[PDB]
């Protein structure tokens, strides 16, 4: 609610290009920790804090948001590897820019855009990151968008945003970070 950058209130002029290195690391999907109940304490806290949704409403919102079969993503300064249903796919990426999206509430967010240079990248040819930041800084978590047509197609996806935290965290530590 407060008008901060990470709540989506920022000046256009402060939005600056990033590089894939901001996202380098070994990352894990948070979805298993929603599914196993670890985040129930998060949804209970959020409901009691904001009053915007009940616990069940929050769980449904985050179920839609977090669902993915991409269980792990490993990122270097120039590559991304997606582990998805018994297969690993790794491609080399270039930065292709950024996009400011305006949400219905009136706040905004920035997606940082990457394109695979490999010819056979398929649904991983176009990849975008959202992490509540608008300019270079090491990512602490991210929400990903990916597909095989264009960056612009992905700007239409607002309700599913598979979400990733560092592999060295337990689900309990991820819950702690979400409560903070
Ligand atoms: Mg996991
Ligand atoms: Na800036
Ligand atoms: Na999936
Ligand atoms: Na998952
Ligand atoms: Na591979
Ligand atoms: Na927009
Ligand atoms: Na972002
Ligand atoms: Zn986030
Ligand atoms: Zn978010």
From Swiss-Prot:
The keyword Ion transport applies. It comes from the Bacteria. One of its GO terms (molecular function) is zinc ion binding. GO terms for cellular component: plasma membrane. It is found in: Cell membrane. GO terms for biological process: cell adhesion; establishment of competence for transformation; zinc ion transport. Keywords: Cell membrane, Competence, Ion transport, Lipoprotein, Membrane, Palmitate, Signal, Transport, Zinc, Zinc transport. The His-rich loop facilitates the closure of the zinc binding site and is required for zinc acquisition. Part of the ATP-binding cassette (ABC) transport system AdcABC involved in zinc import. Binds zinc with high affinity and specificity and delivers it to the membrane permease for translocation into the cytoplasm. Required for transformability. Belongs to the bacterial solute-binding protein 9 family. This is Zinc-binding lipoprotein AdcA. The lineage of its organism: Bacteria, Bacillati, Bacillota, Bacilli, Lactobacillales.
């Amino acid at each position: 609610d407060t008008k901060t950058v990470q709540n989506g209130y920022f000046e256009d002029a402060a939005v600056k290009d990033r590089t894939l290195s901001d996202y380098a690391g070994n990352w894990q999907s948070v979805y298993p920790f929603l599914e196993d109940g670890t985040f129930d304490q998060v949804f209970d806290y959020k409901a009691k804090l904001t009053g915007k949704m009940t616990q069940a409403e929050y769980k449904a919102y985050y179920t839609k948001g977090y669902q993915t079969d991409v269980t792990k993503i490993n990122i270097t300064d120039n590559t991304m590897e997606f582990v998805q249903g018994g297969q690993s796919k790794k491609y080399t990426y270039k930065y292709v820019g950024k996009k400011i999206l305006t949400y219905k509430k009136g706040n905004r967010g920035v997606r940082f855009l990457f394109e695979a240079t490999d010819a056979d990248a398929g649904q991983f040819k176009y990849v975008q990151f959202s992490d509540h930041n608008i300019a270079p800084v090491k990512a602490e978590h991210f929400h990903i968008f990916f597909g095989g047509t264009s960056q612009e197609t992905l700007f239409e996806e607002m309700d599913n945003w598979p979400t990733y935290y560092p592999d060295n965290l337990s689900g309990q530590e991820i819950a702690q970070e979400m409560l903070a």
